[PDB]
Design a protein around this ligand. Structure first.
Ligand SMILES: *[C@@H](O)[C@H](C[C@@H]1CC=NC1=O)NC(=O)[C@H](CC(C)C)NC(=O)OC(C)(C)C1CCC(F)(F)CC1
Ligand SMILES: *[C@@H](O)[C@H](C[C@@H]1CC=NC1=O)NC(=O)[C@H](CC(C)C)NC(=O)OC(C)(C)C1CCC(F)(F)CC1
Lengths: 297, 295
């Protein structure tokens, strides 16, 4: 029904401010390590085509100001891992949650704790698009903001924010500094692919709508091969049987066979929503996973 | 640009589980007081027409099991539709906080909880008819809505019930319902809803700020626009509204009355299948304040 993020408290306690010269952004303080985007070591001129190895060589440990609230932390070591800087500090974060680093798959979702100057401003739910962008809400100073999921007590960090792209969507790395998608951290125009709609998520959302009593779109049936003929037309991800089975819990809770739901989806793709709306939206929503829907129902 | 909630850390530390008999729900633990919906004292039978005073008479402090991940209850009072449980431990995680009663059209974040444990956070608006379009399942009552002002949490909503259209109703933290609703499990009319016009304008400013300008067209008057809003169940626009949009008007160079012009056209002609900030409808749950904060 509602786009819902994870509670952010466990991550709020990890956010610090990282300054190198005049550039400032957010870092993530876990145990005795602060993780931040490596372009914090860039001046405005550097950003256009930086030689990061050369730039960092000129920096020493004491050129990195790490503030945790009103408390400067002391930097005792520094390495570059892909597109992230790792700063070793003398203090281990007393607020370090149980955590892992994971590299998510396109079509999965996650929560973003948007931060400025090391201070949380807001939290919202995002999806990793098939073209490995995210459609975020990020201003200058938001780099180093992180995306995460919470599995019980354990925070899985999956995204760190680095840049905007020409269509206004966003690109970033995993917490090992490897970009999602073909992007590089230099301030040049870069092509994000044709995006596609995450078909399995759209189905999860139609189940969510059914679960909530919104049933007008239901109808006919179809075949998996026949639906994908139509999905391909509309730039939908093709549906696999793995997808069918991932939708199993929702299929079961509703008594609606996936392929029947597909039939109605072909109808909506082919005919449109004739002005009607589904769960208060006038378009087909594809940033709720089957998992998300189960969580919220 | 998208729907952004406040960080929920300060509130997560206040959520407890309150059990009375078989019924369990969420309470809010601040200083030495736990606040929760008074229908925690109801059995399944009671809920059709409870006499809360009589029902509570029969409860003693030790019938209230409070658990923060057990707190000892030393006193209990009913204030309007909320129960106040006095406990012997003050919450060490109590943030700076106030209780406020929000106005319709204002927004707030909801920390949705089950069994005293946070599950998610999301942004809501108090509708003109004093409902909210939330996401609440059984067990979510006592979940709270709030705003954060610097270091200070302003609690404004506690969740009590669903209404026949699937929208939700609840109280301020003094237990006074927003709107005409009562905490009994009977069908209850929410008024006709209306669209929060100032919020729609704020979001059109948000769209223009983010490069989305196709809808910009003409001008109008305040009385002329309102003639069209009234038709479309939009709140009428006032000059206080015009002035509240000042920072946005200023940041874009677009006169509010010009934005009103474009908005009337969208209301008259629809969006011809186009979208604005990725939505195919006019969004009315971002305040001018909200749009500012996000830009
Ligand atoms: C955090 O340092 C910022 C956050 C950006 C700023 C505006 N929106 C955001 O999400 N990151 C950057 O400013 C990056 C830093 C480089 C070292 C990669 N630069 C950046 O995103 O520049 C702009 C906004 C000009 C974009 C550059 C890539 C593009 F040409 F494809 C589109 C514009
Ligand atoms: C927290 O205890 C729940 C949360 C509700 C239940 C499902 N969605 C929600 O938001 N509150 C209730 O169960 C209330 C408790 C009463 C003492 C007021 N009862 C309730 O909401 O009952 C239902 C869901 C049947 C509605 C009753 C009012 C209505 F008739 F107008 C619509 C149905």
């Amino acid at each position: 029904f509602r786009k819902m993020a994870f509670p952010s408290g466990k991550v709020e306690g990890c956010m610090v401010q990282v300054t190198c010269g005049t550039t400032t952004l957010n870092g993530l303080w876990l145990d005795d390590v602060v993780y931040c985007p490596r372009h914090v070591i860039c001046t405005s001129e550097d950003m256009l085509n930086p030689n990061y190895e050369d730039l960092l060589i000129r920096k020493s440990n004491h050129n990195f100001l790490v503030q945790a609230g009103n408390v400067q932390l002391r930097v005792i070591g520094h390495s570059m891992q892909n597109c992230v800087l790792k700063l070793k500090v003398d203090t281990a974060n007393p607020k370090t949650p149980k955590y892992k680093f994971v590299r998510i798959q396109p079509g999965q979702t996650f929560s973003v704790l948007a931060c400025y100057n090391g201070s949380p401003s807001g939290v919202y739910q995002c999806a990793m698009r098939p073209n490995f962008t995210i459609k975020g809400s990020f201003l200058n100073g938001s780099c180093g903001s992180v995306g995460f999921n919470i599995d019980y007590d354990c925070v899985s960090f999956c995204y760190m924010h680095h840049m905007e792209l020409p269509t206004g969507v966003h690109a970033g790395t995993d917490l090992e500094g490897n970009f999602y998608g073909p992007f590089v951290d230099r301030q040049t125009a870069q092509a994000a692919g044709t995006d596609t709609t995450i078909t399995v998520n759209v189905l999860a959302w139609l189940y969510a709508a059914v679960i909530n009593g919104d049933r007008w779109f239901l109808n006919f049936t179809t075949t998996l091969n026949d639906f994908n003929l139509v999905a391909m037309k509309y730039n939908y991800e093709p549906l696999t049987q793995d997808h069918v089975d991932i939708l199993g819990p929702l299929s079961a809770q509703t008594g609606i066979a996936v392929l029947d739901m597909c039939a109605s989806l072909k109808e909506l793709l082919q005919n449109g929503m004739n002005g009607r709306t589904i769960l208060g939206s006038a378009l087909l929503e594809d940033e709720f996973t089957p998992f998300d829907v189960v969580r919220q129902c």
